[PDB]
């Protein structure tokens, strides 16, 4: 039989490992994964009329926003990403750097750091969010100014409600000081630059750092966008992109559901049980995407009995 799984691209490595283990436990089963962007994966079900047994989004909130109640009765937040500061043995002051002093290292004139385009890449605007949130955490109101405002065409205003608003101009108008910053649209250019020592530090997800074998500084959960419990702190920063669209600091949390129109719901239950259980947990730990344990569910009383045992 066949199990159809639509998942976010960033879930590819762990879901590959899940496919292998699930097929090893279930001989006759053919797991057919489709990797795409999270919103695209959801739209396949909600707009294109495609049938999937499992839907996994890199933004859990897309499930209640777009699928509930017509296509989903429940969802579970099961893992997260986290913003880190990646480096290598070639990075200046790598021996010194830690969670307490990372921004002080970045302040040094000879240190160069990379981040993605904040207009086009979530990792890009997230680099700005994390840096701004650092100010309240470390009691230093010049971190964002020194690192970003002084070296780019990005600006900052304070909204009437106390929220920090970062303004990103046209990509060609960001015009970074290249002695301090490497800014790229394609993240692989930045990871390559870190590998060769062209940059010293790189704002990227933990998953990416671990995949490349980079060292990294773990950042406080209050600022690193990893934790559901710090959602109200993350929301204290917003980023306005050139087009006018505004994004808000929020947890980077993965969500899963079995769609209401799944063709093999019973088999889907067993797959999600593997994902939420000890096997899936370790797989996600190993890919730098820490699991939420137990997973946090909405619509728990509408979930299969087997899955209810695996959620809060």
From Swiss-Prot:
Keyword Signal: yes
GO BP annotations, alphabetical order: molybdate ion transport
Gene3D superfamilies found in the cross-reference section: Periplasmic binding protein-like II
GO molecular function: molybdate ion binding; tungstate binding
Pfam families listed in its UniProt record: SBP_bac_11
Designated name of the protein: Uncharacterized solute-binding protein MA_0280
Top-rank lineage group of the source organism: Archaea
Keywords on record: Signal
Keyword Signal (UniProt): yes
Disulfide bond residue pairs: none
Species, as recorded: Methanosarcina acetivorans (strain ATCC 35395 / DSM 2834 / JCM 12185 / C2A)
InterPro entries cross-referenced by the UniProt entry: ABC_trnspt_W-bd_WtpA, ModA/WtpA
UniProt similarity note: Belongs to the bacterial solute-binding protein 1 family. WtpA subfamily.
């Amino acid at each position: 039989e066949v199990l159809t799984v639509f998942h976010a691209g960033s879930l590819s490595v762990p879901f590959e490992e899940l496919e292998a283990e699930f097929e090893a436990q279930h001989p006759g089963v053919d797991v057919q994964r489709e990797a795409a962007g999270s919103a695209q994966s959801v739209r396949k079900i909600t707009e294109l009329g495609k049938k999937a047994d499992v839907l996994a989004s890199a933004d859990y909130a897309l499930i209640p926003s777009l699928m509930v109640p017509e296509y989903a009765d429940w969802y579970a937040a099961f893992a997260r990403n986290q913003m880190i500061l990646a480096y290598t043995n070639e990075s200046k002051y790598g021996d010194e750097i830690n969670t307490d002093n990372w921004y002080e290292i970045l302040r040094r004139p000879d240190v160069r750091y990379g981040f993605s385009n904040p207009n086009d890449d979530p990792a890009g605007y997230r680099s700005q969010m994390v840096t701004q949130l650092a100010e309240s955490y470390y009691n230093d109101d010049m971190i964002y100014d020194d690192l970003m405002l002084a070296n780019t065409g990005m600006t900052l205003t304070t909204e009437e409600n106390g929220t920090a608003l970062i303004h990103v101009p046209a990509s060609e108008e960001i015009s970074p000081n290249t002695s301090k910053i490497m800014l790229r649209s394609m993240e692989v250019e930045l990871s390559s630059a870190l590998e060769t020592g062209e940059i010293d530090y790189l704002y990227i997800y933990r998953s990416v750092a671990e995949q490349h074998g980079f060292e990294y500084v773990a950042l406080p959960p209050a600022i690193d966008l990893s934790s559901l419990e710090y959602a109200d702190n993350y929301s204290k920063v917003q980023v306005e992109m050139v087009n006018g669209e505004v994004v808000t600091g929020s947890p980077i949390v993965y969500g899963v559901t079995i769609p209401n129109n799944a063709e093999n719901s019973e088999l889907a239950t067993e797959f999600v049980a593997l994902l939420l259980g000890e096997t899936g947990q370790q797989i996600f730990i190993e890919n730098g995407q820490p699991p939420i344990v137990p997973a946090i569910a909405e619509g728990k009383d509408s979930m299969p009995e087997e899955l209810q045992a695996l959620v809060v």
